[PDB]
Amino acid sequence: SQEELRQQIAELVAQYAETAMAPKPFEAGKSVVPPSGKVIGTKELQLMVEASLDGWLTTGRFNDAFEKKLGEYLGVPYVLTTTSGSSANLLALTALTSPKLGVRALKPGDEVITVAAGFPTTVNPTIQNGLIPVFVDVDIPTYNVNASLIEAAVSDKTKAIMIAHTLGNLFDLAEVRRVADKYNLWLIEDCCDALGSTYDGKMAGTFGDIGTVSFYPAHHITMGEGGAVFTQSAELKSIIESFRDWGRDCYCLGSLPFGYDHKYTYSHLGYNLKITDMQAACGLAQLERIEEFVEKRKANFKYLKDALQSCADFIELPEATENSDPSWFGFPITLKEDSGVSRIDLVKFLDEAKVGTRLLFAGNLTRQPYFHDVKYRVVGELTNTDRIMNQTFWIGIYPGLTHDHLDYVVSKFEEFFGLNF
Amino acid sequence: SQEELRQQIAELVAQYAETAMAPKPFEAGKSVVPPSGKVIGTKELQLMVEASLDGWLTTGRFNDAFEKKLGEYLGVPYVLTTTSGSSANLLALTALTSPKLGVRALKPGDEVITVAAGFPTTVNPTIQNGLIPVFVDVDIPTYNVNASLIEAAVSDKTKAIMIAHTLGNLFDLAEVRRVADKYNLWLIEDCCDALGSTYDGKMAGTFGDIGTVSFYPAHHITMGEGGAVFTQSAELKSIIESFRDWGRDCLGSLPFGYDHKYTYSHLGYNLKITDMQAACGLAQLERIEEFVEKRKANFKYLKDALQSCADFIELPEATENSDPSWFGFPITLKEDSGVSRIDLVKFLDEAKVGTRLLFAGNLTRQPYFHDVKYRVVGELTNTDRIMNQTFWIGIYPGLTHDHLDYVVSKFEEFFGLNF
Ligand SMILES: [Fe+3]
Numbered sequence: 123s124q125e126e127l128r129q130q131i132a133e134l135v136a137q138y139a140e141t142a143m144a145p146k147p148f149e150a151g152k153s154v155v156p157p158s159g160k161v162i163g164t165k166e167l168q169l170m171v172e173a174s175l176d177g178w179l180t181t182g183r184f185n186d187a188f189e190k191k192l193g194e195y196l197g198v199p200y201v202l203t204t205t206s207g208s209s210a211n212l213l214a215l216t217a218l219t220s221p222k223l224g225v226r227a228l229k230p231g232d233e234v235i236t237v238a239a240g241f242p243t244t245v246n247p248t249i250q251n252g253l254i255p256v257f258v259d260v261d262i263p264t265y266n267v268n269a270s271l272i273e274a275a276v277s278d279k280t281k282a283i284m285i286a287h288t289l290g291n292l293f294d295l296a297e298v299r300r301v302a303d304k305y306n307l308w309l310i311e312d313c314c315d316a317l318g319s320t321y322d323g324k325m326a327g328t329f330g331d332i333g334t335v336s337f338y339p340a341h342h343i344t345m346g347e348g349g350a351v352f353t354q355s356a357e358l359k360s361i362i363e364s365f366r367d368w369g370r371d372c373y374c375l376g377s378l379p380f381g382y383d384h385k386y387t388y389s390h391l392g393y394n395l396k397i398t399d400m401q402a403a404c405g406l407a408q409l410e411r412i413e414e415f416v417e418k419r420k421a422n423f424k425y426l427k428d429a430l431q432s433c434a435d436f437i438e439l440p441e442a443t444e445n446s447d448p449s450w451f452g453f454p455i456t457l458k459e460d461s462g463v464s465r466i467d468l469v470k471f472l473d474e475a476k477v478g479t480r481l482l483f484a485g486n487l488t489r490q491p492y493f494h495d496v497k498y499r500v501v502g503e504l505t506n507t508d509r510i511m512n513q514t515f516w517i518g519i520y521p522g523l524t525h526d527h528l529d530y531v532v533s534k535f536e537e538f539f540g541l542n543f
Numbered sequence: 544s545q546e547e548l549r550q551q552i553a554e555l556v557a558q559y560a561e562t563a564m565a566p567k568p569f570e571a572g573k574s575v576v577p578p579s580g581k582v583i584g585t586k587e588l589q590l591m592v593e594a595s596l597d598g599w600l601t602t603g604r605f606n607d608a609f610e611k612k613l614g615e616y617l618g619v620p621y622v623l624t625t626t627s628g629s630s631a632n633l634l635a636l637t638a639l640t641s642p643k644l645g646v647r648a649l650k651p652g653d654e655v656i657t658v659a660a661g662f663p664t665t666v667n668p669t670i671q672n673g674l675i676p677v678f679v680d681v682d683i684p685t686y687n688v689n690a691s692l693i694e695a696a697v698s699d700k701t702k703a704i705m706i707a708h709t710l711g712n713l714f715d716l717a718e719v720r721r722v723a724d725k726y727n728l729w730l731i732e733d734c735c736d737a738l739g740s741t742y743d744g745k746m747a748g749t750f751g752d753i754g755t756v757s758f759y760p761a762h763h764i765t766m767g768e769g770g771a772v773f774t775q776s777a778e779l780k781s782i783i784e785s786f787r788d789w790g791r792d793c794l795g796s797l798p799f800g801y802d803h804k805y806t807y808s809h810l811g812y813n814l815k816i817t818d819m820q821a822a823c824g825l826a827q828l829e830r831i832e833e834f835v836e837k838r839k840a841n842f843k844y845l846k847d848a849l850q851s852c853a854d855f856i857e858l859p860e861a862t863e864n865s866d867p868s869w870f871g872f873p874i875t876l877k878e879d880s881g882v883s884r885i886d887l888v889k890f891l892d893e894a895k896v897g898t899r900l901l902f903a904g905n906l907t908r909q910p911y912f913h914d915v916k917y918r919v920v921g922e923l924t925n926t927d928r929i930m931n932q933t934f935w936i937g938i939y940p941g942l943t944h945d946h947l948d949y950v951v952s953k954f955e956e957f958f959g960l961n962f
Contacts, residue, residue: 127559131552131592138548138596162598170595170819171552174588175559179581179767179823180760205626208789208813221914242789242807249810250671338813339601346600346817368629369663375910379931381885383900388663388911391670394629394759398767400591400819404600466800481802490807491795495642512798 128175132168139164148526155527157452157478157518158340165410169403178399185402191409192350197325198333200359201352203402204366207314207336208243209395210349214310214332215247215284217351217361220390226306228253232281233499235307237267238487239507244286244312245487255498256280257488259506260288263441265454265482265514268506269294272301275501280305286312288482289454289516290419292321292446295329302330310334314349317342318416318449326449332358337401342415342449343408345401361390368392415521416449422519422528423450429532433539436461452516454482456509465513468538475534478518485511549596553589560585569945576946578871578897578937579761586829590822599818606821612828613771618746619754621780622773624821625787628735628757629664630814631770635731635753636668636705638772638782641809649674649729653702654918656728658688659906660926665707665733666906675700676917678907683925684860686710686873686901686933690718696920697726707733709901710873710935711838713742713865716750723751731755735770738763739835739868747868753779758820763834763868764827766820785809834940835868841938841947842869848951855880855958871935873901875928880958884932887957894953897937904930 143163146153173184181203189201204210219228228234230252236245239260248255258271265288272283283302285293302309309330313319317335319326327333335341337348351362360373369392371384378387427439438456442448457465469479484490486507488500517531536542564584567574594605602624610622625631640649649655651673657666660681669676679692686709693704704723706714723730730751734740738756740747748754758769772783785791790811797806846858857875861867876884888898903909905926907919936950955961 124559124562127555131555131559134548134552134555135596138545138552141545142596142598160600162600167595167598171556171592174591174595174819175556175563177564177583177588179583179765181768205630206813206815208811209626212812242811243813246790246810246812252673344600346819347813347815348817369667369911371910375913377908378904378910381883382904382930386900386902386904388903388909390911391667391915392629392663392911393633393667394627394664394768395814396627396768398817398820400595400767401817464800481805483805484807485797485801485805489796491792491797492790492807492809492811494794496810511801 128172131171135168135171136164139167148524148530150530151476154476155478155518155523155531157480157516158520159522160339160344161415161521162408165407166404169407170400173399173403176399180398181396181402182399184399184406185397188402188406188409191406193352195409195412196327196352198328198352198354200354200356201350202359202362202366203348203350203397204395205349205397206347207334207338207349210314210334210336210351211243211312212247212250213351213362213365213395214334216251216365217332217358218282218308219251220361222361226308228281231279233277233279234281235272235275235283236285237507238500238504239265239482239485239510240286240288240487241483242487242490244284248284249496253281254279257498257500257504259502259504260510262456262506262509263438263454264291264443265289265510266291266293266443269297271502272298276301276305280307282308282310284310284312286314287316287319287326290316290319290451291440291448292316292319292326292443294443295321299329315341315451316449318412319446321446327352328354331355337405341451343405343412345397345405348397348401348405364390365392366395368394418521419450419519422523423453425525426453426519426528426532429528430535432541433535436539450519452480453519454514454516456514459513465515469515471538472534477531477534479515482510482514482516549593552592556588556592557585560588569943569949571949572895575895576897576937576942576950578899578935579939580941581760581765582834582940583765583827586826587823590826591819594818594822597818601817602815602821603818605818605825606816609821609825609828612825614773616828616831617773618749619773619775621775621777622771623780623783623787624769624771624816625814626770626816627768628755628759628770631755631757631772632664632733633668633671634772634783634786634814635755637672637786638753638779639703639729640672641782643782649702652700654698654700656693656696656701656704657706658926659919659923660686660901660904660929661707661709661906662902663906663909665705669705670915677701678917678919678923680921680923680925681929683875683928684857684873685712685862686929687712687714687862690715692921693719693722697722701726701728703729703731705731705733707735708737708740708747711737711740711870712867713737713740713747713862715862716742720750736762736870737868739831740866742865748773749775752776758824763870764824764831766816766824769816769820769824786811787814789813837940838869838938841942842872844944845872845938845947845950848947849954851960852954852958869938871899872938873933873935875933878932884934888934890957891953896950896953898934901929901933901935
């Protein structure tokens, strides 16, 4: 019997995942403390096998379940899965170029306000659609836009604001919101690293017109490769979907003959950025643990910050943005310049001690080699942005790290700083 | 033991597949004859479970195997998997905008010669990179570019030729190459529908600088969603890869000893797949030779039998000196037949016979082309004819001679040839 063969395959899988996905006890000196990672188990492997058995391959049963459950978690009616966080950002900004949006459709030459201290694909979509990025400085130790600088970047060409809640910490949604409204600007919330974060009690990604998230292994939940675009607007949802699906027409011009297959009628300049149900299944399992993961990240963050307070004379510790409850992606630290050493020294020392580190992504996008010939504007100076590029880095606090993992990390900072003496 | 649980699961799925993925017998009037489809079995489901079990998720073990085996099948050293045929086309054209190609790099305002009778994503990447598409007419009944018209579309802004081997039939490679070489133009072969096709005995996709293929279900092999970009140039491979991977390197004013993993040499996307997708495709690769021969067989059989309707419809013809791996069976309804394409398509639909039009028909007439900037050299006569009178039906591995026999009888019935 079929339904029988499945339940019995689920068993052999649920028992394989017991050996395979079993966490190993921490062993100082030998065990590593990566900066991020995935935490999967029996459920993940079970659903993926189910999806495999289905033999459907393209999105369906599991993808429907996933989009629905994530929509309920975020509290939004429209969720569309795509190939990655980057693809999500690309689809978000590109959808706003749709001629169906009339006078407020983004056009080549228009401007989009953002920050230079972020991830490349948060800004690439703007440049890839012919628009112009306008940068303003960020704040330390929140590592998010200094919202007070946004207003001065606005001009006649300003058209939207696309920014990411860096490392799960939220950006001043009150000031960004205020500016967007006053000038009727579109707001795209890049929540690729902030799934679960909240501001003023409201879930991140539900303040703007469109929100994006990533499911790469680093992140709160994974599908291996995957991401999602979400919104509260039916119109935008239909536009996004069209751009993701070959640009073919939907919801419900040119000179095609009457009775031309609708399946082959294209209303947008489109890609094909869909995923498989195998990917969707993994993410569905992961969704069951999200609340658990968000809680643990907040726990590890506090524990690590309290314990690392002993080095406060040499490093600046991270601070959540006022009136927010971030779902931390990582733990951002800035080495003080008058400490006597370079970030290279600390990073390398930690590396030898098995403690993983990551710099704050691009550091300063404008200084990245690929920005050599890009057309952009910067309002004010990127002082803090350059400091981040030179002095900042982050370490792990993800669900896979226990108190023993963190205790080891704290002792290494102490050792490196001679505070154990 | 873990090695046991695996082999034990392999068996349980091996018998699950024999029941689920079992081809049911054809039944005139009940069974459908779709235009395309996938043929998967035990191997596919087995590897996908293996990959699921690995728990690696991102590309790895199976993807390495897939890119390797496919590179061996095509006869190229570099194969890079991506999310879809469309993403592959996007990466192929975009990669040629890399400043590392120097004076050879594609710039906004430059032109790319192609045809309007095709799939949107074959041309969109040109428009998305700021370039200008230049169209020329196609030929009937090969449904591929009328190569003789290409030379006249060449101007001082021309930099590349990107066209697909429509429905598996090959385009005049001898002429395209001649023109490409004479003007030092880049050549991108869109083989999304031509995996296995050959021209002058050489595998399609190995004549140009970059080749692309799709793994969507309707296609020669599938991963559910997936595609690949391939080439013989190590330089391009590195560029393609960078654009696919956040645009990271491997200039600017970054501090010394800045993490190379966070140094970005291109304006990038993230168009990678999972090893679950790669596994499925790896299984599929074990059947490609079988699928290519069956499609060629179904094609011959269908064309021969359908010869009885030659007074009303124009039958497909392989391009001279080629051996196409047919994706579908393209047919053009003659205008003086007294009926319209809608009539035949609807009749066929009612009889459970699937049909598809030739994709965009004429891209320049598609609504999204309303304000696009492009040039057309000559007239798109045949292109417009295709948009109005052409359509295709299935000949994929899932179709048996009984499936085809039924299709032929319905065409005859339609035209009153059975009387
Ligand atoms: Fe439709």
